[model samples]
Target: APLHLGKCNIAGWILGNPECESLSTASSWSYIVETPSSDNGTCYPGDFIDYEELREQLSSVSSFERFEIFPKTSSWPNHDSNKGVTAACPHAGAKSFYKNLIWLVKKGNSYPKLSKSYINDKGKEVLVLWGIHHPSTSADQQSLYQNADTYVFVGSSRYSKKFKPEIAIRPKVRDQEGRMNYYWTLVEPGDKITFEATGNLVVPRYAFAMERNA
Candidate 1:
């Protein structure tokens, strides 16, 4: 069992209010101006949307989503940690505070290749993955897990070579928003005091792969 901070381990915590500022770099937040259902790829509202307009759009953050917290955080958005790589946790002014969904966004030129599917020696579908700079998935650690029956692949990349099995996880295919809702269900704002104050460790470039293994 992985360690959890009395909260969901590895769940990305987002704040409903973009204006909320994080007092420490150890903790951070992310919010989409408006959240639309994660449907078929590519068709985004594609323009600047105000809070009200965000709600009017296909999906709205302030009106629909909620923030989260978890075993989730320690470091992210530290551009200097990794070469040219950086995660997106931009904050809006306090005037824009409102409802929101936690997003694990990547913004630098350091994203590695995405997921690849293949049949493992055990006949299980192994999801080969890349793109995440996390301690759990470090090359040295991952090399120890090549069971050949489970997903044990690379999870970190500096946009170039230096790749290896970083982390492995399994999942069933479904609608994006459906799965999104499921992950949200994994957390609760019970921390009332540090609810959104103490940030959690997040995947450097991915959170979609955070359900099973660390």
Candidate 2:
């Protein structure tokens, strides 16, 4: 799981205080900020902050670099907004059906693709992968998966419960307070993880790379 350190800075504004200086980038601290939420192609708070100016400030840190931008999809200033991707088996018909979702959020211009392989010990083949849209309906769900041009869905969810799969992809690692409440981790390069799929649906897996803000 995300080697969480307690008492970290959450949401930029801590404990209802607005003037608190956010915690720094450290192995022992977590930093969260509230800027704007993207809803139907609109920004929150009337877009008082300019992107160019904001990027300038963000780029000032030598060690402060964001390799990838996993947009916060939660209900922050929005409603019914359970964000991020996750996997679940609603029918519970599969022997196993959950992939430990991990991401390599790199910074770059080109899209990164991930390939699945068996590492000798595991005998079962990694069959299907899917990208689930949080709080998505049967109609909008397909749109989220389609918009991701870089990723591909090799399987089908015909047996899926119409946006009611038993599991979720890209599950959340932390709660609203920036505290890790679930099961996840960020490993060193070359490290490996597993995704289990014994259900009838074809799952879609994704991989991405981005240019670090250096």
Candidate 3:
């Protein structure tokens, strides 16, 4: 039977015609971020992570809709006022609650390698990190806090020709209300063309242009 979009044939819906009391189906609280080893884990071991490394890694995946990391001073929007905003961790895991790291993917690419790291800003090296096979689950809270680090990769497409994508990452306080967002950008490049003439041929040797504006 086809599903109807309007009111059901049963007349009034559950909990009367106006409003119904909410019900709790699950037994306990479900974790937002799970451990790397969990079914939904997104971190792994032996994964290398750095500022540039993190960006390049995510670029390989496609499913991602672009990643973002908001600063501590920033005010996060409440998906629902009823449910208080709660990050996996209330306190800033790293960066002294000053910075939030993020990695996003495109519409088409491959499954990105997942990882997290504590980096040395000046030396540009990974001080600590971890990895996993699946996405995060409830069990990961303990590990995440102790580790306090993470990186993610999303998928988008199977194949892309090439991209010299213009990438941008900026820190800003939005509208006087204090919102945190980074200006991340990347651009794709075009094809190349070459013209050549052999001998003193007045009949024009060879000429053609390569195009890549698709």
Candidate 4:
């Protein structure tokens, strides 16, 4: 099990409120252990997980792993930076399910401290990762556009080839807000839900995930 910190306001900082800055980054990073709700939850608003820790957990039961590194690509906004590759473990069955969903918001790019609130096409005040660079982009838009349930954006592109891979996740449940509110996704039998990565500084590139039970 991952270490747990008590209640914190990381969401406020993520939500763009200055008042929530008191929380330390040490405690700010943690995995959600319970279904999130306003009243009882491991993380309210949201929580962040350590990618390294996640890699270890899922790798413990992984069947295959992939890694790739690319050198400088072009003169684009998110290009010509560090290069890293990631591969996700196959879907683990429900028996291996963590019961809680997971998601990501990338850091270490032109807009590290940027996030926003907007109505999605489904019409929900979705909190998203966004900021100003050459052309501003939002995780919400990318998630929808890609037809993927989760959004994982990379940081610098200085050392890697310009390639973005598609991630496929089976969404089990979702809140009105979007996949961020989703809890409990179906897992494949005997498999553990996991992802693997390699290259220069791969952990800072992504963020984000639901459920009802007694």
Candidate 5:
């Protein structure tokens, strides 16, 4: 009755399993339920993303893990590497590639609003040069190439004393290899972001933290 689907890599397991292979029994072995990650088509359209929660779920195996959602440089080990989770992500849709953008909900706090440019809790101003992943021209790969290290920038936050959250944006790369490629390996994040309290530049996904660099 209970056919265990081993690991996050499921398709291959089903491919050769005797129970799943039988014409008569295979039809009966249909999918039981969907995952939190199964809704990427609807997930990326929202405003602010809770980058915190997304990270926890990467290792939350019992909670229906989206193993592919982990960041390329994170220390966590629950990933799919056979065919390669790295290459599979961009094609998997926005959620898979941008899971680092979320970091709020489950641990604490509601998601912030993804304003293209907004005055944060502080009195200053924060402008997002490259907003979240959209079919929009602002988010195109070409724009990223040209505008890599200079998105999270602007004036101050709202409250004079309140410190804003640092909203970190996309990954940064060196001319040759640096922190991301240190030790001849892929360890990313040596980035730029904004301070929400001062309307400065920074960082999500159930929604993503889509800003630019610099």
Candidate 6:
């Protein structure tokens, strides 16, 4: 026999009866065939709904006729006082926010190879800070860093002519430790990054860029 619209039938007319308790004779609702069978040892990934199957039932409902069931999950008319709001969703995995990068920098400048090309998140490849020139224990490096002002050039020749290079000023506190730290600015595509101590300091023994791979 064909199914009829009723409170017992999920795809039928009434999702639930307003005046009485509900019961189902069959193992499952005839309307919704895709009810989850097993958890598969994983948490709720997402619910799948066949809108095409429910299109007729959804369309037939009256505008004022409030249904206890909808095609998928539904929110209350207003913020539900019964339920508490959460600050954020649960962390799923690494893809959530933090991104992984391909490490290119090494202890030695030549080991990582200067004057080589690298790729960014955008998939475009660009070369930065190329040159195996000996580390500047030379006075040239010292004169550059004498007063604490320093600048780094980052970007390919094409990008250099187009965009202004970024600068990083070493702090007094860090300089006293014989190590200088600079909070570098954002790096964009086609940018070649280079660093040289300016003012009256020896150029650092090594330099490397930590670039994220696509």
| Local accuracy by lDDT, each model | 0.21, 0.23, 0.19, 0.23, 0.22, 0.23
- For model 1, what is the alpha-carbon lDDT of residue 161? 25
lDDT per residue for candidate 6 within 1-214, as digits (tens), equals: 2223332233111212121112223222223222221221111111213424433332232111121111112212211112211111113331110011011112211121123222333323221211111112333232222222233333433444211112223232211112211121223454544433222111121222223212
From the highest TM-score down, the ranking of the candidates is 2, 4, 5, 6, 1, 3
TM-score of 2: 0.22
Candidate 4, residues 103-173: lDDT per residue as tens digits?
22232432232222111222211112211111012354242232222232322212111223332232322
Q: After superposition, how far is residue 98 of candidate 1 from its true place, in Å?
A: 5.7
> Worst ten-residue run, lDDT, model 6?
94-103
Off by over 4 Å in 1: 1-73, 77-102, 112-183, 186-214
Which candidate wins on TM-score?
A: 2
Query: Between 2 and 3, whose lDDT is larger?
Result: 2
Local lDDT at 173 for model 1: 32
* Candidate 2 regions with alpha-carbon error over 4 angstroms: 1-24, 27-132, 147-183, 186-190, 193-214
Candidate 6 error regions (>4 Å): 1-116, 121-152, 156-214
Clashes of each: 11, 29, 33, 22, 43, 25
lDDT value for model 3: 0.19
- lDDT tens readout by residue for model 2, 60-177: 2223312211222320122111222222211133222212222122222222233333121222211111222232232333332222222222222221122222212333322111
Put down candidate 1 lDDT per residue, 1-214, tens digits, no spaces. Answer: 1111222111112222222322112221232232232221111111121323322221211122111222124333421222221112223321111122222322342322223221123221111111222223334122322222122132212112222222322232321111111111111112111111111111222111111211
Better of 3 and 6 by lDDT: 6
Q: If scored against the real structure, what TM-score would every candidate get?
A: 0.17, 0.22, 0.16, 0.20, 0.19, 0.18
